[PDB]
Amino acid sequence: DVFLMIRRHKTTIFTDAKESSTVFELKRIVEGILKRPPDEQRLYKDDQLLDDGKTLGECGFTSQTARPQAPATVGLAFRAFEALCIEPFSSPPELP
């Protein structure tokens, strides 16, 4: 019951995956909305391709590490693969 975040350069997806579940379910539910086939999309989390059918420990996020307030920053790689140009959010103005 862990909620994950997938960040592109502009858009940002918030999804959910069970603790006793694999990457297949989350790949299916992100394919169903982003209409991208699983081979085309790659979860380039922490600047590293991870797997297609392995557990989440080698992926690098657990339920306790990915909190709702601070979710993961899993990147997205699409076949044109592509170059990562994820810009940060706008900085707050007039820092106190």
Partner: protein, 96 residues
């Protein structure tokens, strides 16, 4: 089943429909001529909320989806002092 929230700087944030329906103004914006029932985006064009404030708002949406009636003690939701005074105005404007 998905909302396509965007910021004033163009940074798109995509969350679930039930995730964004917790806010009152989000439900108000979707109902009406802004419906656009193509079942793809149902996007919302915010004009004043910056990107980081909307990121925190979507984080709060996921946080409330997780912990809505889960026991009594709730995990803390840390808010940066710099992102405050802008998250408060957004929450007032979003009726969250």
């Amino acid at each position: 089943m998905y909302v396509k929230l965007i910021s004033s700087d163009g940074h798109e944030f995509i969350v679930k429909r039930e995730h964004a329906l917790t806010s009152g103004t989000i439900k108000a914006m979707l109902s009406g001529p802004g419906q656009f029932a193509e079942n793809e985006t149902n996007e919302v064009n915010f004009r004043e909320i910056p990107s980081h404030v909307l990121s925190k708002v979507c984080m709060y949406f996921t946080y409330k989806v997780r912990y809505t009636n889960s026991s009594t003690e709730i995990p803390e939701f840390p808010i940066a002092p710099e992102i405050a005074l802008e998250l408060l105005m957004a929450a007032n404007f979003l009726d969250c």
